Amino acid sequence: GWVRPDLGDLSKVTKVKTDRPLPENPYHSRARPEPNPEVEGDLKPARHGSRLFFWTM
């Protein structure tokens, strides 16, 4: 008394059951590591203007 699985088999991704603990904190996952800080500030213009050699403005 069995079935003839014509087309429904080998498809339709399922879920099963919670059986064992899910392996969080995977295979190594050592560090990120840390990023470098940014600047937000306040966009002011040039302090006296382009300051190159003589170049007042």
Partner 1 sequence: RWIARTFFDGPEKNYERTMAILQIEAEKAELRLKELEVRRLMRARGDGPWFHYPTIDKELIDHSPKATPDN
Applying CB under 8 A, the residues found at the interface with partner 1 are 36-37, 39, 47-48, 51
Query: Residues with Cβ < 8 Å from 55, sequence gap 6 or more?
Result: 49
Give least dist CB 9 to partner 1, A: 18
Q: Of 3 and 39, which CB lies nearer to partner 1 in the complex structure?
A: 39
In the complex, least distance from residue 51 CB atom to partner 1, rounded to whole angstroms: 6
User: Quick check: 31 and 38 in contact, CB under 8 A?
Assistant: no
Instruction: Answer for the pair 56, 49: CB distance below 8 angstroms, yes or no.
Output: yes
Name which of 10 and 39 has its Cβ closer to partner 1: 39
